[PDB]
Short mmCIF file of all heavy atoms in Angstrom, two decimals:
data_model
loop_
_atom_site.label_atom_id
_atom_site.label_comp_id
_atom_site.label_asym_id
_atom_site.label_seq_id
_atom_site.Cartn_x
_atom_site.Cartn_y
_atom_site.Cartn_z
N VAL K 1 18.84 -1.69 -2.82
CA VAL K 1 17.77 -2.57 -2.71
C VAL K 1 16.93 -2.13 -1.64
O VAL K 1 15.62 -2.25 -1.62
CB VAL K 1 18.18 -4.03 -2.60
CG1 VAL K 1 17.00 -4.89 -2.24
CG2 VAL K 1 18.79 -4.51 -3.83
N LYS K 2 17.47 -1.84 -0.41
CA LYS K 2 16.74 -1.39 0.77
C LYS K 2 15.83 -0.28 0.47
O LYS K 2 14.72 -0.15 0.91
CB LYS K 2 17.81 -1.16 1.95
CG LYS K 2 17.01 -0.57 3.22
CD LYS K 2 18.06 -0.25 4.36
CE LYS K 2 17.38 0.09 5.57
NZ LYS K 2 16.47 1.34 5.41
N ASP K 3 16.50 0.69 -0.25
CA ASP K 3 15.71 1.90 -0.60
C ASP K 3 14.54 1.62 -1.47
O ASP K 3 13.47 2.18 -1.53
CB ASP K 3 16.73 2.97 -1.41
CG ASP K 3 15.92 4.15 -2.01
OD1 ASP K 3 15.53 5.06 -1.22
OD2 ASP K 3 15.78 4.04 -3.28
N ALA K 4 14.71 0.60 -2.47
CA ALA K 4 13.68 0.15 -3.40
C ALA K 4 12.49 -0.48 -2.63
O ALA K 4 11.40 -0.12 -3.01
CB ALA K 4 14.27 -0.83 -4.41
N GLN K 5 12.81 -1.38 -1.70
CA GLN K 5 11.72 -1.99 -0.78
C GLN K 5 10.91 -0.92 -0.18
O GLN K 5 9.66 -0.96 -0.08
CB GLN K 5 12.25 -2.87 0.19
CG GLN K 5 13.13 -4.03 -0.42
CD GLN K 5 13.84 -4.91 0.70
OE1 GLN K 5 13.87 -4.50 1.77
NE2 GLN K 5 14.37 -6.04 0.22
N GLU K 6 11.62 0.10 0.44
CA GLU K 6 10.96 1.23 1.18
C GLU K 6 10.06 2.07 0.29
O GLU K 6 8.93 2.46 0.61
CB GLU K 6 11.94 2.06 1.95
CG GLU K 6 12.63 1.44 3.01
CD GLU K 6 13.67 2.30 3.94
OE1 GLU K 6 13.84 3.48 3.34
OE2 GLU K 6 14.01 1.97 5.03
N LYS K 7 10.64 2.35 -0.89
CA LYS K 7 9.91 3.30 -1.91
C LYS K 7 8.58 2.48 -2.44
O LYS K 7 7.54 3.10 -2.60
CB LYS K 7 10.75 3.54 -2.98
CG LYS K 7 11.83 4.70 -2.62
CD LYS K 7 12.74 5.05 -3.72
CE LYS K 7 12.01 5.84 -4.79
NZ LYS K 7 12.91 6.26 -5.91
N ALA K 8 8.79 1.20 -2.70
CA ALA K 8 7.75 0.43 -3.21
C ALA K 8 6.49 0.28 -2.35
O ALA K 8 5.37 0.49 -2.73
CB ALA K 8 8.19 -1.04 -3.52
N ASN K 9 6.90 -0.03 -0.96
CA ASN K 9 5.78 -0.11 0.12
C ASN K 9 5.03 1.32 0.26
O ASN K 9 3.97 1.29 0.42
CB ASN K 9 6.40 -0.59 1.31
CG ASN K 9 6.76 -2.13 1.44
OD1 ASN K 9 6.22 -2.81 0.63
ND2 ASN K 9 7.62 -2.42 2.28
N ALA K 10 5.90 2.32 0.28
CA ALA K 10 5.38 3.74 0.43
C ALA K 10 4.45 4.02 -0.65
O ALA K 10 3.39 4.55 -0.46
CB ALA K 10 6.54 4.72 0.47
N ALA K 11 4.85 3.75 -1.92
CA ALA K 11 3.94 3.86 -3.09
C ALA K 11 2.69 3.21 -2.98
O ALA K 11 1.69 3.79 -3.16
CB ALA K 11 4.70 3.48 -4.42
N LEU K 12 2.65 1.97 -2.61
CA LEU K 12 1.53 1.09 -2.44
C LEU K 12 0.64 1.74 -1.37
O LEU K 12 -0.62 1.84 -1.48
CB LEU K 12 1.90 -0.36 -2.04
CG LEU K 12 0.66 -1.26 -1.92
CD1 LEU K 12 -0.09 -1.50 -3.15
CD2 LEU K 12 1.11 -2.79 -1.47
N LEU K 13 1.13 2.14 -0.27
CA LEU K 13 0.47 2.73 0.89
C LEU K 13 -0.14 4.07 0.42
O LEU K 13 -1.32 4.36 0.73
CB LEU K 13 1.31 2.94 2.05
CG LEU K 13 0.72 3.60 3.29
CD1 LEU K 13 -0.41 2.78 3.89
CD2 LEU K 13 1.76 4.09 4.30
N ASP K 14 0.66 4.96 -0.22
CA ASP K 14 0.19 6.15 -0.69
C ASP K 14 -0.96 6.07 -1.60
O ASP K 14 -1.97 6.71 -1.53
CB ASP K 14 1.33 6.80 -1.35
CG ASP K 14 0.98 8.37 -1.74
OD1 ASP K 14 0.14 9.01 -0.87
OD2 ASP K 14 1.56 8.99 -2.55
N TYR K 15 -0.98 5.24 -2.64
CA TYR K 15 -1.89 4.92 -3.65
C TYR K 15 -3.29 4.41 -2.95
O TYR K 15 -4.32 4.97 -3.20
CB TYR K 15 -1.44 4.12 -4.80
CG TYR K 15 -2.54 3.87 -5.87
CD1 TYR K 15 -2.53 4.76 -6.88
CD2 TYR K 15 -3.34 2.77 -5.89
CE1 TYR K 15 -3.57 4.57 -7.95
CE2 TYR K 15 -4.30 2.63 -6.79
CZ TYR K 15 -4.32 3.56 -7.89
OH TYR K 15 -5.26 3.37 -8.98
N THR K 16 -3.11 3.38 -2.20
CA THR K 16 -4.28 2.87 -1.49
C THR K 16 -4.89 3.89 -0.63
O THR K 16 -6.19 3.73 -0.54
CB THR K 16 -3.95 1.47 -0.77
OG1 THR K 16 -2.80 1.81 0.14
CG2 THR K 16 -3.55 0.34 -1.71
N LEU K 17 -4.29 4.55 0.10
CA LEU K 17 -4.89 5.59 0.99
C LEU K 17 -5.60 6.70 0.24
O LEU K 17 -6.52 7.30 0.72
CB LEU K 17 -3.78 6.27 1.99
CG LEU K 17 -3.32 5.30 3.23
CD1 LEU K 17 -2.22 5.98 3.87
CD2 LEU K 17 -4.59 5.09 4.05
N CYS K 18 -5.17 6.98 -0.97
CA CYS K 18 -5.72 8.05 -1.80
C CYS K 18 -6.90 7.56 -2.67
O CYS K 18 -7.56 8.38 -3.17
CB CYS K 18 -4.56 8.63 -2.63
SG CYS K 18 -3.44 9.60 -1.66
N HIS K 19 -6.98 6.24 -2.84
CA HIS K 19 -7.94 5.81 -3.83
C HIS K 19 -8.92 4.93 -3.47
O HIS K 19 -10.03 4.90 -4.00
CB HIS K 19 -7.10 5.12 -4.96
CG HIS K 19 -6.43 6.02 -5.91
ND1 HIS K 19 -5.16 6.62 -5.73
CD2 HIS K 19 -6.82 6.71 -7.11
CE1 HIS K 19 -4.84 7.47 -6.68
NE2 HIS K 19 -5.83 7.55 -7.55
N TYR K 20 -8.64 4.03 -2.33
CA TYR K 20 -9.74 3.21 -1.83
C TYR K 20 -10.90 3.94 -1.14
O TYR K 20 -10.72 4.64 -0.13
CB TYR K 20 -9.00 2.14 -0.85
CG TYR K 20 -9.88 0.88 -0.66
CD1 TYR K 20 -10.20 0.13 -1.80
CD2 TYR K 20 -10.04 0.43 0.54
CE1 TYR K 20 -10.86 -1.08 -1.56
CE2 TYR K 20 -10.73 -0.89 0.77
CZ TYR K 20 -11.06 -1.63 -0.32
OH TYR K 20 -11.71 -2.76 -0.24
N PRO K 21 -12.00 3.82 -1.90
CA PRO K 21 -13.20 4.50 -1.40
C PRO K 21 -14.00 3.74 -0.34
O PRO K 21 -14.97 4.19 0.26
CB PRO K 21 -14.09 4.58 -2.57
CG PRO K 21 -13.73 3.29 -3.42
CD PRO K 21 -12.28 2.97 -2.97
N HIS K 22 -13.56 2.54 -0.05
CA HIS K 22 -14.16 1.63 0.99
C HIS K 22 -13.47 1.71 2.24
O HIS K 22 -12.55 2.49 2.41
CB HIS K 22 -14.30 0.08 0.49
CG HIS K 22 -14.78 0.00 -0.91
ND1 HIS K 22 -16.15 0.01 -1.23
CD2 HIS K 22 -14.05 0.05 -2.14
CE1 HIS K 22 -16.29 -0.11 -2.54
NE2 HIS K 22 -15.06 -0.24 -3.08
N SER K 23 -13.83 0.66 3.16
CA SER K 23 -13.22 0.62 4.38
C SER K 23 -12.27 -0.58 4.48
O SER K 23 -12.28 -1.45 3.35
CB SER K 23 -14.16 0.53 5.59
OG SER K 23 -15.04 -0.64 5.34
N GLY K 24 -11.46 -0.81 5.36
CA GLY K 24 -10.48 -1.92 5.34
C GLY K 24 -9.13 -1.40 4.88
O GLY K 24 -9.12 -0.56 4.02
N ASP K 25 -8.10 -1.89 5.60
CA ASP K 25 -6.77 -1.46 5.20
C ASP K 25 -6.35 -2.30 3.92
O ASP K 25 -5.86 -3.33 3.92
CB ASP K 25 -5.77 -1.75 6.32
CG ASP K 25 -4.51 -1.02 6.06
OD1 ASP K 25 -3.92 -0.73 4.95
OD2 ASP K 25 -3.83 -0.64 7.08
N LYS K 26 -6.58 -1.56 2.66
CA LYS K 26 -6.25 -2.20 1.48
C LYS K 26 -4.82 -2.54 1.33
O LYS K 26 -4.42 -3.61 0.76
CB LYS K 26 -6.67 -1.43 0.30
CG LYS K 26 -6.59 -2.18 -1.00
CD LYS K 26 -7.14 -1.35 -2.22
CE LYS K 26 -7.27 -2.20 -3.38
NZ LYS K 26 -7.99 -1.51 -4.50
N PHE K 27 -3.96 -1.62 1.76
CA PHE K 27 -2.49 -1.75 1.76
C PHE K 27 -2.10 -3.13 2.49
O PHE K 27 -1.30 -3.87 2.09
CB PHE K 27 -1.76 -0.56 2.49
CG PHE K 27 -0.36 -0.85 2.74
CD1 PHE K 27 0.62 -0.72 1.78
CD2 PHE K 27 0.07 -1.11 4.03
CE1 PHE K 27 1.96 -0.91 1.95
CE2 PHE K 27 1.50 -1.28 4.24
CZ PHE K 27 2.37 -1.18 3.38
N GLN K 28 -2.77 -3.30 3.81
CA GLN K 28 -2.38 -4.54 4.46
C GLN K 28 -3.12 -5.69 4.00
O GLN K 28 -2.56 -6.75 4.01
CB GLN K 28 -2.91 -4.25 5.83
CG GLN K 28 -2.24 -5.21 6.98
CD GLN K 28 -0.68 -4.94 7.06
OE1 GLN K 28 -0.27 -3.78 7.26
NE2 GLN K 28 0.12 -6.04 6.88
N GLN K 29 -4.36 -5.46 3.39
CA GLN K 29 -5.05 -6.54 2.84
C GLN K 29 -4.36 -7.15 1.50
O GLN K 29 -4.42 -8.26 1.10
CB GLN K 29 -6.35 -6.16 2.36
CG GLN K 29 -7.40 -6.00 3.60
CD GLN K 29 -8.78 -5.36 3.21
OE1 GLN K 29 -8.66 -4.43 2.51
NE2 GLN K 29 -9.85 -5.92 3.86
N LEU K 30 -3.62 -6.25 0.76
CA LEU K 30 -2.90 -6.62 -0.38
C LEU K 30 -1.69 -7.46 -0.04
O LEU K 30 -1.18 -8.39 -0.72
CB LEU K 30 -2.53 -5.38 -1.37
CG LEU K 30 -3.67 -4.92 -2.09
CD1 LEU K 30 -3.20 -3.60 -2.85
CD2 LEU K 30 -4.33 -5.89 -3.00
N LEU K 31 -1.02 -6.96 1.09
CA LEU K 31 0.12 -7.59 1.51
C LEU K 31 -0.09 -9.04 1.90
O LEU K 31 0.75 -9.95 1.81
CB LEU K 31 0.77 -6.83 2.59
CG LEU K 31 1.43 -5.51 2.28
CD1 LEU K 31 2.15 -4.82 3.38
CD2 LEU K 31 2.52 -5.67 1.02
N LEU K 32 -1.34 -9.28 2.58
CA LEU K 32 -1.73 -10.54 3.00
C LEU K 32 -1.88 -11.40 1.80
O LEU K 32 -1.55 -12.57 1.91
CB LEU K 32 -3.11 -10.40 3.69
CG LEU K 32 -3.05 -9.87 5.24
CD1 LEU K 32 -4.48 -9.82 5.68
CD2 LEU K 32 -2.20 -10.73 5.91
N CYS K 33 -2.26 -10.96 0.69
CA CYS K 33 -2.46 -11.68 -0.59
C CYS K 33 -1.11 -12.10 -0.99
O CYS K 33 -1.00 -13.27 -1.37
CB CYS K 33 -3.12 -10.91 -1.65
SG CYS K 33 -4.92 -10.56 -1.13
#
């Protein structure tokens, strides 16, 4: 389970960093949601 949590967050961070054309930490903004 620990591995799953780490991989899930890494995936979200990786995707948002590669795809968000705007400013603002989308990874962090999504976690806030």
Side-chain angles (χ1 to χ4, degrees):
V1 171
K2 180 182 185 299
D3 172 79
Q5 300 176 348
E6 292 185 345
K7 290 178 65 177
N9 287 338
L12 183 61
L13 176 68
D14 189 29
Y15 183 86
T16 53
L17 282 176
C18 291
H19 284 88
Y20 203 48
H22 311 277
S23 58
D25 198 326
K26 187 176 194 173
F27 169 78
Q28 203 66 54
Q29 283 170 320
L30 286 178
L31 292 183
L32 283 182
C33 294

